[PDB]
Amino acid sequence: STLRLRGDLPERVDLLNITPLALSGLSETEAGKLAIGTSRRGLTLGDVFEIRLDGSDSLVIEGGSARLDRVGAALSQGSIRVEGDVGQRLGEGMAAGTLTVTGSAGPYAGTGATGGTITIEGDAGDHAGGAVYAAKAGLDGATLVIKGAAGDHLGDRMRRGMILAGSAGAFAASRMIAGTIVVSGALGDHPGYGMRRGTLIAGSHGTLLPTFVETGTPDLVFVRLLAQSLKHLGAAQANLLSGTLRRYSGDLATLGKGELFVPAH
Amino acid sequence: SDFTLNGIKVEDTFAEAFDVAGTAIIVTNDTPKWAMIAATVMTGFATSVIGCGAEAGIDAELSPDETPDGRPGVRILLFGFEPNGLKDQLLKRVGQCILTCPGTACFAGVEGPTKIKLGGAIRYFGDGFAVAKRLPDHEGKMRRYWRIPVMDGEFLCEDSVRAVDGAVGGGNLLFLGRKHADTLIVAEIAVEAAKAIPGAILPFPGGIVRSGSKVGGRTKGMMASTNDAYCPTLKGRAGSALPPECGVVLEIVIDALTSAAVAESMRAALHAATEIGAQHGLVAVTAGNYGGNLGRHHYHLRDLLEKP
Amino acid sequence: SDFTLNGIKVEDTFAEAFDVAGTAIIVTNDTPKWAMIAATVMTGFATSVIGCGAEAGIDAELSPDETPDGRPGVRILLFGFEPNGLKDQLLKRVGQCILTCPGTACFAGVEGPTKIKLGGAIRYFGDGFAVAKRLPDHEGKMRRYWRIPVMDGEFLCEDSVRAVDGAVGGGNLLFLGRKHADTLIVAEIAVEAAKAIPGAILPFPGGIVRSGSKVGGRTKGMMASTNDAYCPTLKGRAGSALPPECGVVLEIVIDALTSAAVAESMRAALHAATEIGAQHGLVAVTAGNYGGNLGRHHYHLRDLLEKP
Ligand SMILES: [Cl-]
Numbered sequence: 001s002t003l004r005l006r007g008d009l010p011e012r013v014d015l016l017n018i019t020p021l022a023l024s025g026l027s028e029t030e031a032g033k034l035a036i037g038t039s040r041r042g043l044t045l046g047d048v049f050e051i052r053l054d055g056s057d058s059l060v061i062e063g064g065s066a067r068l069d070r071v072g073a074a075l076s077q078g079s080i081r082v083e084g085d086v087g088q089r090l091g092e093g094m095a096a097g098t099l100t101v102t103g104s105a106g107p108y109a110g111t112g113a114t115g116g117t118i119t120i121e122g123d124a125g126d127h128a129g130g131a132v133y134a135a136k137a138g139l140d141g142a143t144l145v146i147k148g149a150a151g152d153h154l155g156d157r158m159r160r161g162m163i164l165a166g167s168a169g170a171f172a173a174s175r176m177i178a179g180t181i182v183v184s185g186a187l188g189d190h191p192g193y194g195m196r197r198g199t200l201i202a203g204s205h206g207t208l209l210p211t212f213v214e215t216g217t218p219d220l221v222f223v224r225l226l227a228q229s230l231k232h233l234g235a236a237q238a239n240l241l242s243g244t245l246r247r248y249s250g251d252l253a254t255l256g257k258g259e260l261f262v263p264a265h
Numbered sequence: 266s267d268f269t270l271n272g273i274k275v276e277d278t279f280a281e282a283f284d285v286a287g288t289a290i291i292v293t294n295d296t297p298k299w300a301m302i303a304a305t306v307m308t309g310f311a312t313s314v315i316g317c318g319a320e321a322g323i324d325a326e327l328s329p330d331e332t333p334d335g336r337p338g339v340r341i342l343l344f345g346f347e348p349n350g351l352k353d354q355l356l357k358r359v360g361q362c363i364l365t366c367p368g369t370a371c372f373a374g375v376e377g378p379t380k381i382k383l384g385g386a387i388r389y390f391g392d393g394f395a396v397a398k399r400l401p402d403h404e405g406k407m408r409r410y411w412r413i414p415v416m417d418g419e420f421l422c423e424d425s426v427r428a429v430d431g432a433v434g435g436g437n438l439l440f441l442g443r444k445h446a447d448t449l450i451v452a453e454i455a456v457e458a459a460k461a462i463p464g465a466i467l468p469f470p471g472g473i474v475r476s477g478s479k480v481g482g483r484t485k486g487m488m489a490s491t492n493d494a495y496c497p498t499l500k501g502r503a504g505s506a507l508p509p510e511c512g513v514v515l516e517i518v519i520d521a522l523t524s525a526a527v528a529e530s531m532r533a534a535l536h537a538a539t540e541i542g543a544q545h546g547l548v549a550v551t552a553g554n555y556g557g558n559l560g561r562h563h564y565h566l567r568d569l570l571e572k573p
Numbered sequence: 574s575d576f577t578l579n580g581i582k583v584e585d586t587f588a589e590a591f592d593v594a595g596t597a598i599i600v601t602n603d604t605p606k607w608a609m610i611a612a613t614v615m616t617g618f619a620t621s622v623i624g625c626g627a628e629a630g631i632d633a634e635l636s637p638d639e640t641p642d643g644r645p646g647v648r649i650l651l652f653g654f655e656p657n658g659l660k661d662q663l664l665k666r667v668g669q670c671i672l673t674c675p676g677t678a679c680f681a682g683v684e685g686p687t688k689i690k691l692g693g694a695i696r697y698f699g700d701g702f703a704v705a706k707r708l709p710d711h712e713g714k715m716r717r718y719w720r721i722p723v724m725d726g727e728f729l730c731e732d733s734v735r736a737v738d739g740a741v742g743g744g745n746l747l748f749l750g751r752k753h754a755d756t757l758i759v760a761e762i763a764v765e766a767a768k769a770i771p772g773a774i775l776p777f778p779g780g781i782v783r784s785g786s787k788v789g790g791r792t793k794g795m796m797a798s799t800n801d802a803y804c805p806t807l808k809g810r811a812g813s814a815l816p817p818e819c820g821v822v823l824e825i826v827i828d829a830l831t832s833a834a835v836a837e838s839m840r841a842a843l844h845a846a847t848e849i850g851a852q853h854g855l856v857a858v859t860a861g862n863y864g865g866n867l868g869r870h871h872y873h874l875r876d877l878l879e880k881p
Pocket residue numbers: 013014069070
């Protein structure tokens with residue numbers, strides 16, 4: 001099933017429940033009439049895309065705009081491939097499956113995602129892996145891979161899962177409940193503000209918080225397990241765990257159960 | 266009725282084994298030396314489930330490739346009557362023989378249907394500083410481990426360990442021989458053969474038992490008594506089941522995670538003992554039974570004739 | 574004014590040890606191998622008295638000259654809270670790790686004021702066939718032994734074993750060091766020094782403890798919890814009792830039949846560790862105390878300065 005984007009989007013678009021499972025049941029003529037527009041004037045799937053449908057769990061959106069909100073949200077089946085850029089809330093509340101994006105992503109990508117894998121070959125927006133307004137948690141069990149560079153508040157109020165970022169902006173892992181974030185390269189200023197639990201590993205790092213204390217350079221069994229887990233998934237950050245690391249305990253402002261690893265020298 | 270294997274008489278009996286709860290754990294250390302120290306202290310004081318807490322043994326030493334840790338490890342089995350009694354014994358032993366040993370780490374050894382809490386209970390020694398982590402292993406399965414803070418570092422312990430159903434214990438075959446010194450060697454190379462089978466162990470000291478566990482007794486409510494029939498000091502009188510040439514008897518008890526492993530462990534012991542048996546004075550080989558109605562699994566030596 | 578020995582800082586504390594019930598037994602076999610197999614399975618699963626039944630260890634290996642049997646033996650100690658709990662643990666362990674082991678024989682190890690029935694209780698496994706014999710030893714004292722008939726032959730067991738009064742356990746000193754691999758070696762050569770003292774053992778695996786048993790707990794009613802002060806993962810925050818150069822802590826726990834042996838066992842470990850300590854990055858050596866009011870015996874490191 002392929003959706004060929006006809007042209008530029010005049011308004012923001014909500015692609016929720018436009019999952020290959022839902023699309024299979026619908027007829028090709030009936031599926032075209034599904035409205036995805038935000039505004040009162042609205043927009044139907046036929047107005048935006050050239051719909052080619054087949055009874056399959058695989059979906060490919062050819063062409064993407066930064067105005068594609070909630071793309072792949074609540075996805076429980078199959079896969080969605082977006083050859084282009086996307087908007088906010090990539091796979092909001094994704095249950096399971098795979099969701100790959102060629103371009104960059106908007107803010108709040110990965111919110112409330114339970115299972116499956118969200119891959120952004122481009123850059124992630126602000127609050128990538130972070131919780132939305134009034135949200136209990138951000139990433140909640142799903143694996144989030146950003147080959148490019150994430151913005152501010154990566155993994156904000158993250159509860160579960162794993163984030164594999166290339167680069168990260170300021171205030172990464174803020175208000176973190178739990179989880180694992182391995183950014184291969186630079187990490188912005190003030191990481192892990194309010195961190196409760198979790199593991200943050202980065203190659204470079206900016207200025208650290210006063211409530212973070214250094215533990216030293218410990219050879220831990222968990223690091224060995226996390227390394228083999230990244231090796232098995234083909235993660236580029238698997239090499240970051242090869243050498244001896246410098247450790248810091250989670251933000252002491254809250255219960256200091258989180259941690260931060262940075263290369264020794 | 267009489268059977269002869271490798272020129273040595275073998276009684277046409279069966280070994281009466283029982284159904285038991287069994288589980289396995291993999292304990293790793295930075296060196297194989299301390300991996301073994303950790304397991305040796307855990308397996309000690311575990312020769313029977315009725316008197317000792319459980320029946321424990323080391324299945325195999327693991328190389329850094331055969332382990333989920335990547336560090337040299339030990340696969341160590343534990344058997345108990347009830348899945349609750351087994352959980353109780355594993356919690357005690359892992360908590361005070363594994364956790365205490367420096368640089369160790371506990372993982373689930375075997376796959377099974379019922380679940381046993383391990384890391385989730387020792388986590389409470391962490392006094393609230395322990396954290397839990399979920400990671401996919403080399404096979405692709407999500408596993409949950411606990412990180413207990415300790416003096417040397419972190420004691421990493423997997424939350425749950427699985428207990429295999431249908432683990433069989435009590436499979437035994439005993440040897441009759443002329444002299445203790447020589448006949449011990451027959452049993453020694455017999456246990457070395459049995460240890461090799463995966464998932465099977467021999468809980469008794471060196472695998473060998475010298476006290477013949479007999480069901481019942483002469484006086485009052487005897488639950489266990491010595492096997493006067495196979496005692497050389499009670500020879501010559503009615504009720505002694507050993508010939509005048511015999512002067513020493515030794516028993517070999519095998520426990521395994523799978524019933525087939527009990528039979529294959531017995532077979533390997535039966536053959537290895539008889540091949541060299543004539544040289545060291547092995548008179549005959551029999552198996553221990555209780556009457557047939559106590560234990561579900563019967564391992565007849567007549568089925569163990571085929572070479573391994 | 575904190576003491577510094579051999580270039581290594583030594584904390585000006587004391588080790589809080591407790592009074593405990595202690596006894597010793599000598600187990601002999603035909604070969605030194607099987608005497609050790611018997612000793613190793615009995616000592617296992619006995620690292621603390623609170624969780625495990627008792628605290629056990631092997632004092633020293635005995636030659637055929639040092640034994641009442643005339644056969645190579647092993648002197649093995651056992652410690653318990655109460656003389657009744659000590660009696661219960663010895664009966665269980667000798668009954669199922671010594672009696673079961675082939676070619677063994679159990680004798681009383683140490684002399685003491687209180688009496689513990691040992692052979693007189695295992696004799697009931699004989700099912701009425703066991704006999705008692707009274708014979709004078711090489712010193713001229715009349716001793717009573719039991720002869721339990723078993724498969725391999727007879728399990729000879731002395732009727733009574735003596736329990737010495739004033740056995741002390743819990744004497745401990747812990748090492749702070751830069752790296753687990755190297756500092757383990759410091760603790761390893763420390764236990765080898767401590768083992769040598771007669772009448773003293775180290776119950777934990779290989780003599781070393783990695784989990785700092787701290788009295789109390791943060792929440793609810795906890796009997797034991799991890800020692801967050803000496804945990805390297807909880808560094809940098811208030812309440813961490815170790816400097817930034819330190820990254821690993823290892824504890825050594827010593828039990829002995831006599832109070833002086835605990836101090837002398839501590840002294841040898843303290844000196845052996847520091848002599849080689851600078852080579853392996855040993856930062857400092859301190860001792861674990863509970864406040865002074867829990868344990869009667871206080872072993873201050875200020876009195877252990879004199880060379881052995
Ligand atoms: Cl939206």
